[PDB]
Amino acid sequence: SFTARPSSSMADFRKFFAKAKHIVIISGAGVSAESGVPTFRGAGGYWRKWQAQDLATPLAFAHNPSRVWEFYHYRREVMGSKEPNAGHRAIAECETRLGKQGRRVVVITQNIDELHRKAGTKNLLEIHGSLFKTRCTSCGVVAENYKSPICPALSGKGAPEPGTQDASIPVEKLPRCEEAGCGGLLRPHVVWFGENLDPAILEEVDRELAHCDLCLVVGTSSVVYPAAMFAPQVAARGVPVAEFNTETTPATNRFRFHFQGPCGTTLPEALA
């Protein structure tokens, strides 16, 4: 009986929740699945023939920037009509209600979809960037960008079905920098597989993890690093961590609680 296996007791989690002064909520793509945004775990991890982790890499962008921009353009256009779900709303409303009591809630998200922002979350660390920002590969400037389509050559492009032909847009016609007449090639302002997360963001993440007294880890596979090690760091300080996922993960047995099921059902219950 010694070995702790995670608890499924909602009442015991809610006893910690009632007292918690600083809650960190870490989210991955599962928190947006109920808005109609597929995760990359299964069939939704394919775009044409490629797996998503093979397109979100600086080697794909260096050698076929038109293909990587078609994939991000597809995602931007699909995301424009997507709405926050009950999970994103519970998260946002929890922050607002606890903030009035002087209690802190912060969201550390792997997602680039901005749906936590749309839901009303204020304290948000977007650790992998944003679908709706660009970064210039020449001058480094980061800009918000919601334009549909981002550039004329991408109009009508990005269809996801296997067998769709590549647009093969010449690099000069991909999104270009307009800042002080720079003209450089833009990329998505998204952290890709093989790249370093921003140091300033990581320092803020470390501060929140070190100071929190309760952590939720929601809709993440806990196999994407370094994010996968955030909630185990909190658990190993002896702070309760509650995982909300439709399945178990490689990190589940490190945590105090595991609440199995769709987070749009379990989050409103846990955060009421």
């Binding site: 992998h128 093989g194 140091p199 196999v223 994407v224 690093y225 370094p226 090690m229």
Partner: peptide, 8 residues
């Protein structure tokens, strides 16, 4: 450990 990767 600042570099993004997949485990397993």
């Amino acid at each position: 450990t600042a570099r993004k990767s997949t485990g397993g």
